[PDB]
Amino acid sequence: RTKVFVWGLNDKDQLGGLKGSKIKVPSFSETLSALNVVQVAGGSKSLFAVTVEGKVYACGEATNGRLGLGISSGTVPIPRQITALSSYVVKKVAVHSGGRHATALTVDGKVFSWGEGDDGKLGHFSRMNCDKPRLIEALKTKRIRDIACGSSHSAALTSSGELYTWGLGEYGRLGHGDNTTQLKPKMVKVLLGHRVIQVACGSRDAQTLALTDEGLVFSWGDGDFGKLGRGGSEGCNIPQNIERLNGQGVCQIECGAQFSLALTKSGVVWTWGKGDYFRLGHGSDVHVRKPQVVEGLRGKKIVHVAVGALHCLAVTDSGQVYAWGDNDHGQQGNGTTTVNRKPTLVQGLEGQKITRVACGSSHSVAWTT
Amino acid sequence: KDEDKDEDE
């Protein structure tokens, strides 16, 4: 039994069967709690859930086929199972908080893609849309360990440590030393010799983060608002080390909308990037062009984080959920629509020992195990 | 204004 809670925007029923359009307090999803989930993932007005059995369920807005259910217009108000993947045990589903395509990774290392195919982000040597998933053929001989998706590009890394990127090339988000759109997954040659263990991808004029088993954080791509973390605002298409995070023992990285977040093994959260609408959690909406510790969580051991477009959610070791950022749609979960300029404790989840959070564009998930 | 911001119906 894994209790699941949802809140935020619900205009396209992306919360999965709740009434109203601004769910401003976390709310028990009867539909998702029943699925017994191991992961939830939030895309643009979309929700995805991976069950313990390996099944994938989606719901929300169906435009651009972003849900993989074979339709590509309308809304799916109750979570429905992605039938194309029933023969495969899905480990993880990757989707950006403002994304219109996703990928799903199976336990046997296979990778599928579906949704908006623009800029070749699906990986199929083409810019076709896929209304249902489709096996990324160019990765078949590679045991894939993790996957990530921005809004215009996608990544995947292998168990041997090599990182692949594909998709929109512009502003160097792929990391290949030019700005050429890649329609196939291509190896980031610069990061060879490092064992890459995570990767995160941004939306719009996108950044990309990478993490090696030595705790080294690489960033590249577009650099507006200093989301590359190395000051100023100059992009680049070659991975560069974010020197500040070195030795800090960073273990999770994520990319919201024009900002970057890292969490350390010691429970510290670092954010930087675009400041507007308090998405960084520093009490002010200025841009932060070199990674800063979120002071509002000093001494609270954050064990999990999730970023949406304009909000973040952090989980303490003791099952508490903090939030910060924008609240036009209740996604802060403080019962109002008032912005959370600093990390604020989330209402109505007392006694629920939350272990994982996930976010979408304007929606939030907390769940247990 | 801010393009990365969702809207309601």
Domain boundaries, chain A: 1-369
The pair of three-digit structure tokens given for residue A226, joined into one six-digit string: 């200093």
The pair of three-digit structure tokens given for residue A322, joined into one six-digit string: 């903090």
Contact A303, A354 (CB under 8 A): no
What is the three-class DSSP state of B8? coil
- Chain centroid, CA A190 distance in Å: 24
Q: How far apart are CA A305 and CA A318, in angstroms?
A: 14
CA nearest neighbour of A368 among A10, A36, A13, A30 = A36
3-state SS string for chain A: CCCEEEEEECCCCCCCCCCCCEEEEEEECHHHHHHCEEEEEEECCEEEEEECCCCEEEEEECHHHCCCCCCCCCEEEEEEECHHHCCCCEEEEEECCCCCEEEEEECCCCEEEEECCHHHCCCCCCCCCEEEEEECHHHCCCCEEEEEECCCEEEEEECCCCEEEEECCHHHCCCCCCCCCEEEEEECHHHCCCCEEEEEECCCCCEEEEEECCCCEEEEECCHHHCCCCCCCCCEEEEEECHHHCCCCEEEEEECCCEEEEEECCCCEEEEECCHHHCCCCCCCCCEEEEEECHHHCCCCEEEEEECCCEEEEEECCCCEEEEECCCCCCCCCCCCCCEEEEEECCCCCCCCCCEEEECCCEEEEECC
Q: How far apart are CA A62 and CA A20, in angstroms?
A: 19
Contact A8, A363 (CB under 8 A): yes
Q: How far apart are CA A333 and CA A312, in angstroms?
A: 11
Positive or negative, the Cα torsion across A14, A20, A25, A30?
A: negative
Angle at CA A258, nearest 5°, toward A272 and A192? 80
CA nearest neighbour of A204 among A177, A235, A179, A170 = A170
> Phi and psi for A83 in degrees, rounded to 5?
-65, -30
Cβ–Cβ of A22/B8 closer than 8 Å?
yes
> Phi and psi for A33 in degrees, rounded to 5?
-55, -35
Burial class (CB in 10 A: 0-12, 13-18, 19+), A358: buried
Give the other-Cβ count within 10 Å of B7's Cβ. 10
Residue type, A26: P
Q: How far apart are CA A48 and CA A71, in angstroms?
A: 16
CA nearest neighbour of A303 among A313, A317, A285 = A317
Partners of A9 on chain B (C-beta within 8 Å) are 6, 8
Positive or negative, the Cα torsion across A34, A35, A37, A40?
A: negative
Q: How far is B6 from chain A (nearest CA, A)?
A: 7
Partners of A362 on chain B (C-beta within 8 Å) are 6
Optimal mutation site among A329, A331, A332, A364, interface B, most CBs of chain B within 10 A: A329
The pair of three-digit structure tokens given for residue A326, joined into one six-digit string: 């924008």
Partners of A11 on chain B (C-beta within 8 Å) are 8-9
Q: How far apart are CA A235 and CA A352, in angstroms?
A: 42
Any idea what DSSP says for residue B3? T
Cβ–Cβ of B4/A362 closer than 8 Å?
no
Ramachandran sector of residue A8 (left: φ over 0; alpha: ψ -120 to 50; beta: rest): left
Q: Identify which of A12, A22, A204 has the shortest CB distance to residue B4.
A: A204
The pair of three-digit structure tokens given for residue A305, joined into one six-digit string: 């984080």
Technique of determination: X-ray
> Phi and psi for A191 in degrees, rounded to 5?
-85, 15
Tell me which chain A residue has its CA closest to the CA of residue B9: A11
Cβ–Cβ of B8/A328 closer than 8 Å?
yes
Contact A248, A264 (CB under 8 A): yes
3-state SS string for A167-230: ECCHHHCCCCCCCCCEEEEEECHHHCCCCEEEEEECCCCCEEEEEECCCCEEEEECCHHHCCCC
Partners of B3 on chain A (C-beta within 8 Å) are 204
Angle at CA A96, nearest 5°, toward A162 and A202? 65
Paired strand residues for A90: A106
Positive or negative, the Cα torsion across A223, A224, A228, A229?
A: positive
Cβ–Cβ of B6/A309 closer than 8 Å?
yes
Residue recorded with tokens 């199976």: A106
